Design an enzyme around this catalytic site. Structure first.
Site, PDB file in Angstrom:
ATOM      1  N   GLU A  35      23.906 -12.414  87.409  1.00 39.06           N
ATOM      2  CA  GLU A  35      24.669 -11.550  86.543  1.00 39.06           C
ATOM      3  C   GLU A  35      26.118 -11.475  86.972  1.00 39.06           C
ATOM      4  OE1 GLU A  35      23.915 -10.282  83.712  1.00 39.06           O
ATOM      5  OE2 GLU A  35      21.734 -10.438  83.665  1.00 39.06           O
ATOM      6  N   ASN A  46      31.553  -8.797  75.381  1.00 37.03           N
ATOM      7  CA  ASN A  46      30.723  -9.480  74.409  1.00 37.03           C
ATOM      8  C   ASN A  46      31.445  -9.295  73.084  1.00 37.03           C
ATOM      9  OD1 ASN A  46      28.360  -9.912  76.259  1.00 37.03           O
ATOM     10  ND2 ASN A  46      28.301  -7.676  76.216  1.00 37.03           N
ATOM     11  N   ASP A  49      29.391  -8.213  69.700  1.00 34.99           N
ATOM     12  CA  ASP A  49      29.023  -6.832  69.389  1.00 34.99           C
ATOM     13  C   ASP A  49      29.956  -5.782  69.970  1.00 34.99           C
ATOM     14  OD1 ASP A  49      27.737  -7.320  71.986  1.00 34.99           O
ATOM     15  OD2 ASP A  49      26.803  -5.375  71.688  1.00 34.99           O
ATOM     16  N   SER A  51      30.614  -4.869  73.029  1.00 29.72           N
ATOM     17  CA  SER A  51      30.145  -4.080  74.154  1.00 29.72           C
ATOM     18  C   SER A  51      30.617  -4.815  75.408  1.00 29.72           C
ATOM     19  CB  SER A  51      28.618  -3.925  74.125  1.00 29.72           C
ATOM     20  OG  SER A  51      27.986  -5.169  74.328  1.00 29.72           O
ATOM     21  N   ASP A  53      29.712  -5.601  79.666  1.00 34.20           N
ATOM     22  CA  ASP A  53      28.764  -5.509  80.776  1.00 34.20           C
ATOM     23  C   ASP A  53      29.599  -5.245  82.020  1.00 34.20           C
ATOM     24  OD1 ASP A  53      26.515  -6.185  79.172  1.00 34.20           O
ATOM     25  OD2 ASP A  53      27.247  -8.235  79.194  1.00 34.20           O
ATOM     26  N   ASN A  60      25.361  -2.709  80.439  1.00 32.46           N
ATOM     27  CA  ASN A  60      25.936  -2.632  79.094  1.00 32.46           C
ATOM     28  C   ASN A  60      26.396  -1.274  78.600  1.00 32.46           C
ATOM     29  OD1 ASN A  60      25.518  -2.841  75.833  1.00 32.46           O
ATOM     30  ND2 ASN A  60      26.132  -4.823  76.669  1.00 32.46           N
TER      31      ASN A  60
END
Length: 130
Positions: A35, A46, A49, A51, A53, A60
């Site tokens: 990750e 992202n 959408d 959002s 991380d 998220n």
């Protein structure tokens, strides 16, 4: 902060991550590796959408932390996304615990399914003394 492999392993053990909701330390290590590469300031937007991380576990902003700029967001973990960018990973660990308290568990992270699930993950904690 970019954690060294074993240094992170012990820190996570101390935070009660080993076996939390059936998830072994080696699995949390595998997740952190893919990750963020064990980097606490890692952020990934992202575009699809809107959002983002955050942190070592790439948590998220749509469901787990609040960053204010994510459409249709909730604050399930009830944290500010800022807390997941600190060198101290206590809040990130608490958030990661909340995520896996949902039925999906560790599967909530697709990166876990791709590179950790059904694999020999021992290599992530070998030699660490955990």
């Amino acid at each position: 902060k970019v954690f060294e492999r074993c240094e992170l392993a012990r820190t996570l053990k101390r935070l009660g991550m080993d076996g939390y909701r059936g998830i072994s330390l080696a699995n949390w290590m595998c997740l952190a590796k893919w990750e963020s590469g064990y980097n606490t300031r890692a952020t990934n937007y992202n575009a699809g959408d809107r959002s983002t991380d955050y942190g070592i576990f790439q948590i998220n902003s749509r469901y787990w932390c609040n960053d204010g700029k994510t459409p249709g967001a909730v604050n399930a973990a009830h944290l500010s996304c800022s807390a997941l960018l600190q060198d101290n990973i206590a809040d990130a660990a608490a958030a990661a615990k909340r995520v896996v308290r949902d039925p999906q568990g560790i599967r909530a992270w697709v990166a876990w399914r791709n590179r950790c699930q059904n694999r020999d993950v021992r290599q992530y904690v070998q030699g660490c003394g955990v």
